[PDB]
Amino acid sequence: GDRINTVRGPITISEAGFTLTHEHICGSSAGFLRAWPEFFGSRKALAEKAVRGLRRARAAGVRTIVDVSTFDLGRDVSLLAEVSRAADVHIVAATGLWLDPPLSMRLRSVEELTQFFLREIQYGIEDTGIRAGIIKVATTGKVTPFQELVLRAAARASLATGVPVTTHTAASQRGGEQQAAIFESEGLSPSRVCIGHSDDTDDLSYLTALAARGYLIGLDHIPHSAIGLEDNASASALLGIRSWQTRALLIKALIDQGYMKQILVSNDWLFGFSSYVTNIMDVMDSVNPDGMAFIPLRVIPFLREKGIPQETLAGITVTNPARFLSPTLRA
Amino acid sequence: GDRINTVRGPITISEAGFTLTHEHICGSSAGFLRAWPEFFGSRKALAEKAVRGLRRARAAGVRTIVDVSTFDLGRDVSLLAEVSRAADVHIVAATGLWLDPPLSMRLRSVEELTQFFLREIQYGIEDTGIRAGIIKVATTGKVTPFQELVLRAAARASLATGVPVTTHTAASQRGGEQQAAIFESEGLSPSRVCIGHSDDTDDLSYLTALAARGYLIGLDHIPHSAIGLEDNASASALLGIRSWQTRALLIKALIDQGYMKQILVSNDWLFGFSSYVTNIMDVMDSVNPDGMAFIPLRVIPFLREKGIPQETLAGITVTNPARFLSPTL
Ligand SMILES: C[As](C)(=O)[O-]
Ligand SMILES: C[As](C)(=O)[O-]
Ligand SMILES: [Zn+2]
Ligand SMILES: [Zn+2]
Ligand SMILES: [Zn+2]
Ligand SMILES: [Zn+2]
Description:
- Chain A: Belongs to the metallo-dependent hydrolases superfamily. Phosphotriesterase family.
- Chain A: Zn(2+) 2 binds at residues 136, 168, 197.
- Chain A: Keywords: Cell membrane, Hydrolase, Membrane, Metal-binding, Signal, Zinc.
- Chain A: Homodimer.
- Chain A has 331 residues and is an alpha/beta fold.
- Chain A has one domain: Metal-dependent hydrolases (TIM Barrel).
- Helix content of chain A is 43%, strand content 14%.
- Chain A has 13 helices and 13 strands.
- In chain A, strands 7-8-9-10-11-12 form a 6-stranded parallel beta sheet. A 3-stranded parallel beta sheet of chain A has the order 3-5-6.
- In chain A, helix 2 crosses helix 3 and helix 5 (110-123) packs parallel to helix 6 (145-161).
- Chain A binds chain B through residues 28-32, 34-36, 38-39, 71-72, 74, 100, 102-105, 107-109, 112, 116, 119, 125-127, 274-278, and chain B through 28-32, 34-36, 38-39, 71-72, 74, 100, 102-105, 107-109, 112, 116, 119-120, 125-127, 274-278.
């Protein structure tokens, strides 16, 4: 109803405040942080870096982040709880599956996957008793048969619990349209779904058409940009070469079209990143030293400068995430 | 030098006894047992099944198993330590990588992989202080570029520590030849290497040639013969069409060639198996109700009746594993 799960327990949605709806503490792989912590220097070093970063985000006004790391992104909810408590920032944990499921997940049926997502929402993650407040799913442009199982299981878990679904897409492939079709074939309301990484495209017809159907639009890659780093193949492939201003103007664009209630904004940042080339984190941190504070420190003023009312910005950063995260469906 | 690391700490070579050199407590995926234990009923149920299975094997003469589950096979060394202590059977843990590395492993350099294998051997696995006593690697027929990195990292870790390397091969594609070539390019002695799943072929010339170069030959799929399951659409690509006796005779064949010193025998069994289709464990347990006791209860007597002397059988099951596992440079 009006309470959501965080890694410190249930909170009322009024307490969430300024919420970043797509972030990561650490982007990794199942088991990896605990098997090889010195990849990140140490577990302690990683935790301290996350606490420093989250504390700066809190100074800048952030009160909640949603960590959309799944099992196969190496989600360690014990780490999430430790850094949440120390930074005093709410963290919502995720269930679901991203793009790197191990065999023990890849070979499961839609029914089995449904019961796994329900366990993480209704019972707890691992043996921690920490419950997920969101379901994260990911597809390639053309959805694979396994990915379709994952989306149907996510829809079924969402209908049984009321918690929302948020996606990874290839926006240049208009990936959201095939995702939306599968979700609706399962009876899932578009108001329970955020189509993420949507600022990766400048195709406003695609974006507005999803928004008109009641989907939430995740403009969550705003600081991702390898401009100046064109000589870095791996960084360019990851971040793109569109400017952060270009990405942010899509926020204005969707407001101007009348869809401010459908916008969710985030940084998609992280404090460690093992599921890409070595030292990618140092490259990203040089691009955006603000980290997760990039949205409140850079983007919000940029948009106010362009004339967007304060009330509108507050609605996008506070009201929209609250409506989205509040469990809404079967009691 | 003459101490072997187990999940309960170091043991002397003489303590190892009858050793099964390729086994699994649970074939899974990294993080999976912790995240979804009810897939196996419960963690408790899996543990209890494994303790009964190990005690059965112990009553059939087994004293040590080598669990060749890697990180990406969901190795949980805390589970191994628990079941080892309750069954009074030594378990040697593994490092290395099998065929399901996640992105955080697949994108690593040979230098990075070498350091991870070294951490698990020299420092410990996770935060447990339990050190690996063997390095497990796997390839599919024609070695992929990443698999080649794994094999080279395994060779370098072995050379720094004396710990042996054991492999998963496609024997029908003669995959050991490519593995050996890579190991030798690194300066690794063949006597530190077991080429596994070798009973999956009838090509005796292929096996003898490897043995003559000094490789250990892992005849570890003996009970994966099934016989009777052609109605199944997932128990013929995992299990066999040749009888277990046929596989077992390869042991005798190699003995007769004068290579009994080169032979390692095991079951490649497990007590849980999530990295396959659902309910596979039920199929497997019905086909081989002996589990890890299949080697001592069926294969040893079969060889004895074919005229292999006790002393030779003890050499294969006690002496060879001890020489293989004892860290050596
Ligand atoms: C963990 As990601 C690079 O898919 O947002
Ligand atoms: C874990 As296996 C079936 O490759 O020996
Ligand atoms: Zn993503
Ligand atoms: Zn992300
Ligand atoms: Zn194998
Ligand atoms: Zn095996």
